[PDB]
């Protein structure tokens, strides 16, 4: 009657037990709301081809702890240090520069999508001295360029984050490190 669903973000992977007879739009809205987005932003695949939110996992054949797919094209950069950046969003304001105080909000995740810290928890954003040695040295590379407006996601090998010590009771030792950052003003 009852199914076992995981629903997989690359890094995060969350289960749900829906009824095999109800379409799968209240299991991808439930997903969707627990990263605070729209469902519309986010496109689910099962085996391939995308899922309709109209469509039931008995119309898809789906057995027992079958897998779906959660995505947003994507152009995933990889910079000299290790450093890998993907532009979720493009921003047309002014670029950020070294020597500049920029403004952003962010969230952090370790690779397995636990969620470590963010600014808009306290609504507070963020500002510091770009490739002035305040933030790991993934952010002084991974913020210059961005334009006001833009979504930066940076991927931080632990050797541009916090190194093999990482940061007391939350990150561990030699953890890569997942921020998207947007920038508010520079
Ligand atoms: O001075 C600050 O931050 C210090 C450097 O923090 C950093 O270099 C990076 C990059 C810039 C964004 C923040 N992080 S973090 O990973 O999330 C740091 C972190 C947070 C939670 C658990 C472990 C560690 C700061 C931040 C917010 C408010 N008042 C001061
Ligand atoms: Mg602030």
Redesign the pocket.
């Given at each position: 009657t009852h199914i076992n669903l995981k629903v997989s973000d690359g890094s995060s992977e969350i289960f749900f037990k829906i009824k095999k007879t109800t379409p799968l739009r209240r299991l991808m809205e439930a997903f969707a709301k627990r990263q605070g987005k729209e469902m519309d932003s986010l496109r689910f695949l099962y085996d391939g081809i995308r899922i309709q939110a109209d469509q039931t996992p008995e119309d898809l054949d789906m057995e027992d702890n079958d897998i779906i797919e959660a995505h947003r094209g994507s152009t995933v950069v990889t910079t000299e240090s290790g450093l890998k950046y993907e532009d979720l969003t493009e921003g047309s304001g002014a670029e950020a520069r070294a020597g500049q105080t920029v403004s952003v909000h962010y969230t952090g995740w370790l690779t397995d999508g636990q969620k470590f810290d963010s600014?808009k928890d306290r609504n507070?954003?963020?500002?510091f001295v770009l490739g002035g040695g305040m933030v790991i040295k993934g952010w002084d590379e991974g913020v210059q360029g961005m334009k006001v407006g833009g979504v930066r996601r940076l991927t931080i090998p632990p050797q541009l984050g916090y190194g093999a010590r990482g940061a007391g009771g939350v990150i561990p030792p030699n953890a890569t490190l997942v921020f998207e950052v947007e920038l508010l003003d520079v």
């Open positions: 600014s507070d954003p963020f500002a």
